[PDB]
Amino acid sequence: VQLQQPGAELVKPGASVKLSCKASGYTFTSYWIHWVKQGPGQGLEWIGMIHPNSGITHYNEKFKTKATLTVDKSSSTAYMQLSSLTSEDSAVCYCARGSSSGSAWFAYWGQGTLVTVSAA
Amino acid sequence: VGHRRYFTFGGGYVYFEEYAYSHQLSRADITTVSTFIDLNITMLEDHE
């Protein structure tokens, strides 16, 4: 079981961006996928969750428009479309799996993408 | 946003996306559900 992410995204603030995770090991269809945002040293904040099998999304109340989930079953891939970016949004975003128990204690993750929303 | 509509036109459909004509389609290109209750009434066969 593994989740592959880009290490970082050096994308200018303003125009929206895309992020992906590739699943491996387990059955990508039969487990929930959650997503958590955390800046540098901040208390990590759960940004949303999604059922790949059905496509039913659930956004943290402050992330309807900041982000938008997506799932491609074909490539075992989960996607975020990050809209309305800011400089501080540069942060580590983790895609994680929960068991069949939707308790979502988040056993296995990926390395997480340290998005760098910047023009440097 | 997200606008996409099919409209009945001639014998088929015309499909628009985002308020711009996209293309035509035949009736066969769409799965057809049925609001009909089947009644397979046969007939007394001839007998001699």
Next chain:
Amino acid sequence: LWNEARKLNPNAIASVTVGRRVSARMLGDVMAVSTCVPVAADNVIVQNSMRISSRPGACYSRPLVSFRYEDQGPLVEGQLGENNELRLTRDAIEPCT
């Protein structure tokens, strides 16, 4: 009659027509469908009050509910639609009397 009933609420017509319990909308002269996910009966909570303090004289017109997809997943809010359907959006407000 079936043509002019599906324009009122496509959900019921589409569900009774396809065979499953689907959610549908109308894209002009066709119906776009999507299968609905079942939820176990014992995992629902009906909130006691339908009123909304931040909107005096307005109230939710059908009960507020909370539920969990899996037997032990998190608790998610919704609103009780017709025929056991849970809308995910708390917007069916009426001016209450």
Next chain:
Amino acid sequence: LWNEARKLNPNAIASVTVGRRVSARMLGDVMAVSTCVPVAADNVIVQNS
């Protein structure tokens, strides 16, 4: 059901009831009708936008 469907769009109900393809409206508790003129299929243009 037929009474309460004709109030939604009288055109379809009146056409399927009379037999022809007519255009109708409601004058209270009655339907006023008028026959519709056919137009050949090949003589239509759909504007793009």
Next chain:
Amino acid sequence: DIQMTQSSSYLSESLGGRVTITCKASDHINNWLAWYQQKPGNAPRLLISGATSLETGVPSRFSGSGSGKDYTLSITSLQTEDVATYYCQQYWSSPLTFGAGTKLELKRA
């Protein structure tokens, strides 16, 4: 809503020492709480899954417990390779909420 109040922002201790972090909930949860650890250079790990439940990858030097609104994690034989943030986590109602984080460090510079 549900709010996690994590008792200490940091907790430093000499090598082989004994510590006990804890935190509080803003509404009763019925022992549906988890405890994580995250070092700066890794995805956070799992220590407790259920208000009192150890699992693989965490020896007895870690131990979790709690009830009602107060839950805690007692740590034994603190080492130089346990310095990290420690996280309360709830899984009773969306939105899911994480703890602020307790800095478990050493008694050295």
Next chain:
Amino acid sequence: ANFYVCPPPTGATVVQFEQPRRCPTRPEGQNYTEGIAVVFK
């Protein structure tokens, strides 16, 4: 019974009601020619 949760349907799948189907008229009926008959054994 059960509850159901329903996602908002994307335009991915499309369905249409089956159009009215023709169904034949009654059989024409047999041509019966009257007559006066005498049956011999």
